[PDB]
Symmetry: D2
């Protein structure tokens, strides 16, 4: 179980981030949701996760492109819960175009959400995790964090950077009970397995890396791509 523990999951209003929220909720953790969503959808999902967690579930709308707003969520968490115990970064935007025609606006935007946000999100979560002497940081990347595909430059570039970000931080905090890891999924609903990875599966992996058994797994990436990177 995950009682008293508090989890902050960016991009958790839909798909993977949401699937992760539901599992960590079933296990009794407090969940801070986040991300784009019509008011109707934000309340629906928020009340849905709430009805799973014995703890406190609540949503925060920090735009991952605004480092100031991200500090808000990171600060309100320190206040409300006394620091996040689990930090999973799932916020991610995309855009496909060949580099020589890739909007600079789109580049800066993709790097903000797919890379820099994890920075702002981690730099804020670390201190309380150090003090408490325990922590779990789990970045949701992608196969494109290990290998590339054409016309996805900004994307690919950010997942590779997230790799390096993970490796560094993990070293920095190795001796503090905190682990920093990455999950690289394939096509979630090139893949030898010929099947979509389901958000429920991806979530189970997150759940594992959060357990105390995965204390000695740090600074690494776990590929779940059905044999994608195996070639």
């Amino acid at each position: 179980s995950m009682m008293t523990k508090t989890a902050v999951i960016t991009g958790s209003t839909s798909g993977i981030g949401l699937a992760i929220a539901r599992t960590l909720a079933k296990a009794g953790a407090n969940i801070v949701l986040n991300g784009f969503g019509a008011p109707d959808e934000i309340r629906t999902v928020t009340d849905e996760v709430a009805g799973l967690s014995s703890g406190t579930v609540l949503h925060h709308p920090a735009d991952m492109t605004k480092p100031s707003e991200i500090a808000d969520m990171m600060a309100m968490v320190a206040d409300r819960f006394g620091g996040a115990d689990i930090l999973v970064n799932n916020a991610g935007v995309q855009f496909v175009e060949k580099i020589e025609d890739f909007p600079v606006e789109q580049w800066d935007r993709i790097i903000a959400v797919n890379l820099s946000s994890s920075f702002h999100t981690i730099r804020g979560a670390i201190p309380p995790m150090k003090k408490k002497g325990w922590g779990r940081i789990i970045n949701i990347a992608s196969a494109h964090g290990l290998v590339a595909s054409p016309f996805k430059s900004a994307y690919v570039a950010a997942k590779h950077g997230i790799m390096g970000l993970t490796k560094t931080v993990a070293l920095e905090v190795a001796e503090s009970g905190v682990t920093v890891n990455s999950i690289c999924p394939g096509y979630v609903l090139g893949q030898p397995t010929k099947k979509f990875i389901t958000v429920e599966q991806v979530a189970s992996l997150a759940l594992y890396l959060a357990g105390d058994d995965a204390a000695q797994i740090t600074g690494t990436h776990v590929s779940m791509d059905g044999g994608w990177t195996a070639q």
Copy 2:
């Protein structure tokens, strides 16, 4: 829960393999132990594990250097249980010495146990798993499958070899409901920023996960458990 499911585990009379044999046993799986040890020890361990599982637990003495013996153990499994559902390769030997003084004798032995044995082991397991449309192959390698170190040449070449084997076999069987992965532990209590020994229970918990149904989309990959070793 692994009730009904059968697990073969090489080098499980001690250390990591044993921890994993125990974990799978508590889950209901039949276990086939394998490995070195005096007769007295072999039966002590075999009971130990049996005492946990409501299924059948027994030991096979196949020598990982003698592929025909591996072949027999694999044959016995197919007959007794209709083939292993889970297969974990943990058998491994070591020999430290700079390469120019490294005994050919020793290179040949390490390669046989650390690399070739998984070939012989997998070849006999793939058909049954294919027929049943489900399977789990978990090769216990090391962080040395990713990075190297001086004086462990045969050991390092073997682990890296297992890497390529894992990838390959995964691709071959990706559409048959079988997964094929590798666990890459660091210094285990039988270069680590974590400054803590990896426990055998820890490694076994990772094995238990990959055997589960959730881990069906994890295949042809490695998972380092080295407390940060490879991150640098």
Copy 3:
């Protein structure tokens, strides 16, 4: 030789970038220099490289943090020389501090020079290279583009992203006679070799990847770290 060919080398006023400029000059290519430097130093070095190249050597002061200024150099090159034939990215800044105390100003700055600049620099160089049906893009990264070290997060993150950037672009332009590659040096004046890599050595590698023999080497990284990453 490299006659009529034009090379653009960011961060080429000192050290590695400069060493590369000197070799491509000895081989008769036009060289566009770039980077920080007192007027005295800019003229000294510019006249030094000039006196090596049978072609035209000239310096451009685009601040790698200003995507608009980078376009300038990329545009003036298309005008003056009809597109850069070789593009090596060597511009790089650094800052050491543990993540939870890492100035956001410093993060954004490091990503600008170490990562985003290569984007702006490449998106501008590609079209003329495609048209001409030949090209060589060589990103100077570092061992930290493959492995990590503590308190160098922004840095590490950028070199890993440069990895992914390289892999993508290389795929995009595979069939156009252009190759995109990365060089990852160790400590240039952890290393089993116990010796500093010299800028002259790093340069020789750049020179090779520029030859026609290295046409089939694309989307890859060449580690020159004296055994650093071998462990």
Copy 4:
């Protein structure tokens, strides 16, 4: 210019190894050829290469499966030239078949030629290079040392094995003036976004570079020449 320098090259009676033997020959190096081929062919090739080098060119028939024969060729080199300055492993065999139908016979053969032979080859070369304080070991592997493919299990495990061996030996000899690297070619004209065959001259140019003095700080690493293969 490699005048005075001696190069041993396994599997150089054709293909990549031959291209590399030629390149080093034009540079002034003594060459020791090795590999399969009818008698008529062996001497034709040996002349061909000799005709380029002002140094001594000759061929040794060591069978890469018989380590004692490798040992003799290595011994003959130490006596004739006082040890190889450059050593490139290019000998390699293939066998395509899904693993459950993969002949043990064949697994053993591929592993011997593609992996173990470099062990035996390197062990006899390291001492002389150490004494002279300079050396170049260039293992010609493949893109399969990085990624896998179905039905090439022994081949893939062997290349990955060479990877780990290269890393290890590099670390062992890093301070002795010797470098140990790997070239990882793609489809060579004897999955590629470049849609062009890698030529043997191309691969040989990369070998020539790594042998040079400039490439002294490149060690324990791989260089893929696959036109993009591994980038995806």
